[PDB]
Ligand binder design. Structure first.
Ligand SMILES: [Ca+2]
Ligand SMILES: [Ca+2]
Ligand SMILES: [Ca+2]
Ligand SMILES: [Ca+2]
Ligand SMILES: [Ca+2]
Length: 316
């Protein structure tokens, strides 16, 4: 489709005027969170970077250090996320899922499955730049088995082009997946990793259809979500992303709020990282799949300034 974000460049932007408002909001005893909230969610990421620059040229101060000293809580985490340069943000969040004891597999899967090969090539490059090390080495460092192998394949950013549907291979592949799926995805993993990882998106959507007509089922049905198995989670994310990235991300949001409490980390990461890409399309998938709006779901799951900020990111 045509991807539509919910945040665009503010017309009539003046980074100096904005820098002064933020300075005033912060200056002295207490904070005007409401003024910060509304300013920042109504400027695009590139404008926020122009505000930081102007804040340091006027005041000799660092805006992000200031925000971090003035704010707290989930509101702080949301604001700091917004302030990240768009080009770094996916990298940063991968770096945080990997760095330390254990791994945050959830974030690894989500970003690596739902970002396009072009996004991935850029994240790899920025990760190396920023963090000194290769994303691929750090992933191999943290993960094992076919989960690791399948991430590394996706990390090569080399899917076949969408050109010729070789309906002979479509039938072969669909049969291969039929077999493997009946076998609970636990045999011949090497076969399917190559099919999921390297075939073109238009091929694979053909495979999924063909599959269903062979089995009667949708290939997702042969996996169950809430329970375990990193490779299965990864398989499910890839199949959903091949179908529709905004649908898969809408579902990740739904489940970030569904149940006791919220996965605020996920809610923040998706709302921010997609705000200027496809968040509008995500809003429409959510509504049609989950028969409620994202807005009301956020409004019911969150509170305070953190909630106001998110509802202004979201829209309607
Ligand atoms: Ca203050
Ligand atoms: Ca206040
Ligand atoms: Ca703080
Ligand atoms: Ca680790
Ligand atoms: Ca909840």
């Amino acid at each position: 489709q045509v991807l539509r974000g919910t945040v665009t460049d503010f017309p009539g932007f003046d980074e100096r005027a904005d820098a002064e408002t933020l300075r005033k909001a912060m200056k002295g005893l207490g904070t005007d969170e409401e003024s910060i909230l509304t300013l920042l969610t109504s400027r695009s990421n590139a404008q926020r970077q122009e505000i930081s620059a102007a804040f340091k040229t006027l005041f000799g101060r660092d805006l992000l250090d200031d925000l971090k000293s003035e704010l707290t809580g989930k509101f702080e985490k949301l604001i700091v996320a917004l302030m990240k340069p768009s080009r770094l943000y996916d990298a940063y969040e991968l770096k945080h899922a990997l760095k330390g004891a254990g791994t945050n597999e959830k974030v690894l899967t989500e970003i690596i499955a739902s970002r396009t090969p072009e996004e991935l090539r850029a994240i790899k490059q920025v990760y190396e730049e920023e963090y000194g090390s290769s994303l691929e080495d750090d992933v191999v460092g943290d993960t094992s088995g076919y989960y690791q192998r399948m991430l590394v394949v996706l990390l090569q950013a080399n899917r076949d082009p969408d050109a010729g549907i070789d309906e002979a291979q479509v039938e072969q592949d669909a049969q291969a997946l039929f077999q493997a799926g009946e076998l609970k995805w636990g045999t011949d993993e090497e076969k399917f990793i190559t099919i999921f990882g390297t075939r073109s998106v238009s091929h694979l959507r053909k495979v999924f259809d063909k599959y269903m007509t062979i089995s009667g089922f949708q290939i997702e049905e042969t996996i169950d979500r809430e329970t375990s198995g990193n490779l299965e989670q990864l398989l499910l994310a890839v199949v959903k992303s091949i179908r529709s990235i905004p649908a898969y991300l809408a579902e990740t949001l739904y489940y970030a709020m569904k149940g006791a409490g919220t996965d605020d980390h996920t809610l923040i990461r998706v709302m921010v990282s997609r705000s200027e890409i496809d968040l509008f399309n995500i809003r429409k998938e959510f509504r049609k799949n989950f028969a409620t709006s994202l807005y009301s779901m956020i409004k019911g799951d969150t509170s305070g300034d953190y909630k106001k900020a998110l509802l202004l990111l979201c829209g309607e």
